[PDB]
Structures are given as C-alpha cells and as structure tokens.
Design a protein around this ligand. Structure first.
Ligand SMILES: Cc1cc2nc3c(=O)[nH]c(=O)nc-3n(C[C@H](O)[C@H](O)[C@H](O)COP(=O)(O)OP(=O)(O)OC[C@H]3O[C@@H](n4cnc5c(N)ncnc54)[C@H](O)[C@@H]3O)c2cc1C
Ligand SMILES: Cc1cc2nc3c(=O)[nH]c(=O)nc-3n(C[C@H](O)[C@H](O)[C@H](O)COP(=O)(O)OP(=O)(O)OC[C@H]3O[C@@H](n4cnc5c(N)ncnc54)[C@H](O)[C@@H]3O)c2cc1C
Ligand SMILES: C1=C/COCc2cc(ccc2OCCN2CCCC2)Nc2nccc(n2)-c2cccc(c2)COC/1
Ligand SMILES: C1=C/COCc2cc(ccc2OCCN2CCCC2)Nc2nccc(n2)-c2cccc(c2)COC/1
Ligand SMILES: [Zn+2]
Ligand SMILES: [Zn+2]
Lengths: 227, 227
C-alpha cells in the first residue's frame, strides 16, 4: 500500500508536525510506501496562474486557467511542481491531508495544492466525476486540528457541527475526483489540552492508522454532512 | 459609504472582470468611495509564513503563526501588504468578494487574503467573535461565478444546494468576524450561457447594486444554509 501525506504546517515541532511524524512512523512500520509533501518546506506556489503551463499558451490573449491547464495536462506541458504532485497522487492508495483548520477550511497553501494539482484530465473528466472520477479506487482522509473545542463544533454550539465544514472538501473535492473518503480525524483544541492529553491524541491517531486499511468509507452525502 | 471589492480572477476580460467593473461603475455613480484589491495583479502572497511579521531580529525557536500575527498586529509590525488590506477593510462599510468558485470555495489566492488579513486583534478577539466580532457594523457579500449549473447546485442535484458550500465563508469567516452578510450573488455557468444571458447576469448585478444599501442581511444560520 502506498500513502501520500499532504502536510500543511509551518512548524516541525507543532502538534500537526507530531501527527504527521506519527503517521510516517506507523505507516512505515506496517511496510507501507510513504511520501510526504511538506508544502511550506517546498514553498509550494498556491496561485493559479499562467506560470503553471510551460511554453506557449493555447490562447495568449485571454487567459482561461481551466482550459489552459486541461490542455497542458493533455500536452504534457504543466509545470514540474504540479506534475511531481500528480505522480505521487496517481501512485497512492491513500491520500492523507494533515492540516490546521483555517477559516473552516484548509490553509491557502493546501487550497493551492488542490486548485493546481487536481486538474481536468488528471483528477476528473466531463464525464468522469463523482463516483466516475479519475482517482476512483483510491482513499482520502482529512486529519484536521482545530482551535475550537468539540463542544463548539456541535449542532448547537457556536460553530455548528464539524461535519458542516467538511462538505466542500469531502464532497466537492475528494468525492468529485472519485476518492472514497474515510472518516475524518479531528483533533480538537490541542492548545487547550494538557501535554499528556496531546500525547493521547497523537497516540489515538497512530492507533487508528494501525487499522486504517480495514475501515469502510463514509457515505459522502448531504445527509451524512447535514442530517 | 465606502466599498472594498476583493477580486480574484486572472483575466480582465473574464465574466468575473465584467462583474467587478459593473460594480465599480454603479457604486461610483452613486457617489460611493470604491476600492478594488485585484489579488492576481497585486501578486498577493497567499502563504501564511513568518515573512508576514516584520522586524524580527532572531527567529523564535517555535513559530506559531496565530500568536505571532496577533502580536505583530498589536505592534504594527505586519507586512505592508497585510497592513494595506487591513486599512481598506477598516474603512469599508461593505466588502464584496468577486470570484470564480474553485473546489466549492474561494481560489487559493483569496483564501490567502482571508488567512493573512483577518488576523486576531484586527478581525476578531478572544473573546470577540460572531456577534462580538471586531468588524461588527460592516456588511459583506459574496459574488460567485460557477462552472456548474443552477440545477446541479440544488438539493437533488449532483452538487447539493449552493447554500451548502457557503457555510465556511459566510458563517465561519464573515459572521465570525462580525460582518452582517448580504445574500450572495451567484452567477451560474456563464460559459454555458448565451451572450444575451451573460449580459443579463451582468445587468442583474448592476441593478441589484442600485439598491444594495436598502437590503436586509440574511440570517446567517444553519437553518438558512441547510434547511
Ligand atoms: C489563519 C487561521 C485561521 C484559523 N481558523 C480556525 C477555524 O476556522 N476554526 C478553528 O477551530 N480554529 C482555527 N484556527 C486555529 C487553528 O486551527 C489551531 O491553532 C491549530 O489547529 C492548532 O494546531 P497546531 O498544530 O498549530 O498546534 P500547536 O500550537 O503546535 O499545539 C499545541 C502544543 O502541542 C505541542 N506538541 C507538539 N507535539 C506534541 C506531542 N507529540 N505531544 C504533546 N504535545 C505536543 C506543541 O509543542 C505545542 O506547544 C485558525 C488559526 C489561524 C492561524
Ligand atoms: C481550479 C478550478 C476549480 C473549479 N471548481 C469549481 C467548482 O467547485 N464548482 C463549479 O461550479 N465550478 C468550478 N470551476 C469552474 C469555475 O468556477 C468557472 O469556470 C468560473 O466561475 C467561470 O467564470 P469566468 O469569469 O472564468 O468565466 P468566463 O469564461 O470569463 O466567462 C464566460 C464568457 O463570458 C464572457 N463575458 C465576459 N464579460 C461579459 C459581458 N459583460 N457580457 C457578456 N459576456 C461576457 C467572456 O468573454 C467569456 O466568453 C472551477 C475552475 C477551476 C479552474
Ligand atoms: C473559538 C475561538 C477560541 O480560540 C481558538 C483559537 C483560534 C485561533 C488561534 C488560537 C486559538 O486557540 C488557542 C487557545 N486558546 C486558549 C483559550 C481560548 C483558546 N485563531 C483563529 N484565527 C482565525 C480564525 C479562527 N481562529 C476561528 C474561526 C472560527 C472558529 C474558530 C476559530 C474556533 O471556534 C471559536
Ligand atoms: C459540472 C461540471 C461541468 O464543467 C464545469 C466546469 C468545470 C471546470 C471548468 C469549466 C467548467 O465549465 C465550462 C463550460 N463547460 C464546457 C462545456 C459545458 C460546461 N473546472 C473545474 N476544475 C476543478 C473542479 C471543478 N471544475 C468542479 C468541481 C466540483 C463541481 C463542479 C466543478 C461543477 O459541477 C459539475
Ligand atoms: Zn460526497
Ligand atoms: Zn452565521
């Protein structure tokens, strides 16, 4: 089994860093092939621009990012940062995203990974999306950390259910590309937690990874997210 | 009345470009003060990094973006790009976001504007969020374009209701900062639309803007989004 961890945190000593490292440790111990895309260390470009296409654009006068990247994918003329990520995704059986929640979503650097890597022709086609997406047969999992507490992320709490914010990521992105989605790993409020509680949350993640290949996906439906 | 338009499209001749331009024209005609932050033209940095804090002689052993930006805000030592955006927001009565939908969310460059500009001390405090957010008394409005059709973005359509994807943006971001949220402007599927239909969608936005100051905000609730 091949695993790609797309990791989005600036600080190696962070709680996110520890969750990433325990995932490498545990998945490596199992004998999995593991790759980490450390986006901040890579200084990944997040902006969707004409620099993402090498050589001459299909229409140099009016720039249409979607058309140009779709054609570049077909012509093997995407920027090498993009194509390097695509190779990692193509080979992976499981893609784990490890990030702190920023504005009920992914940090911009990770949003940029999604925007630039998951291009038409690679991740989906028309037709060829949702269950027919081009990354069908693969698993994806969101491993998210929050400032807010679990109680705040309940239906009656100030933030609403955590599932509510997952919709654009799980349905709109991962399911759209054909992934099956494993239940999210949400590590609530590490700053509020004691050191030993944080150790427990890292241990919980490690333990979950021991049996990750036996899990069933979640149903990636509006009902799951909002019902 | 002062308006800031935060605009995220690479191509001035785009449908998004036209929506931005009609907004400038209409609001300017009314006598409003209008500013546009053209993120791609500004080459706005989207990544949340230690470069966002100026005047650091020696790097801390552990970098905590949220703590460091909070402190930098209080010390007036944020990067000049951030500071300049904050001044525009501080003065604005209405903030319009004009963007194409990317993965059920904002383009990464706009996500980076949110991540970097809306820092603790400026947009919210702890406590001082949701109805006590620091941008209370201001209005915000999302003007979104999509590839998918209106019918796809219905409860029974493949993408679910358009309101579902608005939650992280409207509740988790804008309401969290204390904004009152005006109903979104969603211009569906301009590529599919005929030239006449496209002109109609631009005219509809301009027409709406004629009376924007008389609108009531939406109730920014789970019921509004998911009911
Ligand atoms: C721009 C921005 C937007 C945000 N938006 C949101 C939002 O929408 N919703 C929300 O809820 N929160 C939000 N937050 C808060 C953010 O999600 C949290 O601050 C983040 O998830 C905390 O994770 P961390 O890895 O940075 O924590 P850290 O601060 O690294 O974790 C706390 C401590 O854990 C320690 N630690 C590291 N490894 C271990 C280990 N193995 N065992 C024990 N301790 C360890 C660290 O040393 C550190 O002292 C936002 C923050 C920012 C900056
Ligand atoms: C990375 C990525 C992710 C995406 N994710 C999603 C998603 O999650 N959901 C989704 O639905 N879509 C998604 N899309 C599609 C994207 O949202 C649409 O392509 C975008 O909204 C179209 O807006 P535009 O301004 O680029 O259109 P354009 O292609 O510029 O507009 C269509 C036509 O309108 C013309 N036009 C411009 N101004 C006028 C005028 N005044 N009058 C008449 N015609 C005019 C233009 O010349 C053009 O021919 C995604 C695209 C990308 C690249
Ligand atoms: C909760 C806010 C409380 O602070 C959490 C918290 C939050 C941040 C940094 C540290 C931190 O707890 C650091 C630890 N602090 C110790 C006591 C209070 C938390 N920063 C931050 N920045 C932008 C948006 C949000 N949070 C944001 C947006 C929406 C919803 C939330 C956060 C989370 O629910 C609302
Ligand atoms: C609809 C897919 C149809 O293509 C729309 C469409 C899509 C794109 C570019 C142009 C475009 O219509 C340009 C005009 N097209 C050319 C022929 C007619 C439609 N690109 C794109 N890229 C990444 C993700 C998504 N869309 C994405 C993710 C989730 C949901 C959707 C899109 C939207 O619902 C699913
Ligand atoms: Zn789904
Ligand atoms: Zn709300």
């Amino acid at each position: 089994k091949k695993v790609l961890i797309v990791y989005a945190h600036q600080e190696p000593k962070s709680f996110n860093g520890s969750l990433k490292n325990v995932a490498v440790d545990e998945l490596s111990r199992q004998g999995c092939t593991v790759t980490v895309s450390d986006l901040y260390a890579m200084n990944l470009e997040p902006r969707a621009t004409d620099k993402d296409i090498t050589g001459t654009l299909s229409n140099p006068e009016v720039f249409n990012y979607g058309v140009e990247t779709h054609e570049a994918y077909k012509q093997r003329s995407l920027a090498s940062d993009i194509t390097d990520e695509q190779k990692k995704v193509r080979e992976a059986d499981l893609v784990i995203f490890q990030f702190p929640l920023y504005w009920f979503s992914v940090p911009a650097i990770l949003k940029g990974w999604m925007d630039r890597v998951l291009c038409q022709g690679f991740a989906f086609d028309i037709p060829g999306f949702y269950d027919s997406g081009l990354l069908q047969g693969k698993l994806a999992l969101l491993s998210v950390t929050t400032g807010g507490t679990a109680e705040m992320y309940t239906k009656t709490g100030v933030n609403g259910d955590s599932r509510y914010f997952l919709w654009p990521l799980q349905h709109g992105t991962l399911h759209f590309c054909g992934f099956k989605v494993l239940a999210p790993q949400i590590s609530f409020a590490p700053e509020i937690a004691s050191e030993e509680e944080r150790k427990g949350m890292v241990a919980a993640w490690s333990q979950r990874l021991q049996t990750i290949w036996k899990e069933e996906p979640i149903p990636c439906t509006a009902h799951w997210h909002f019902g």
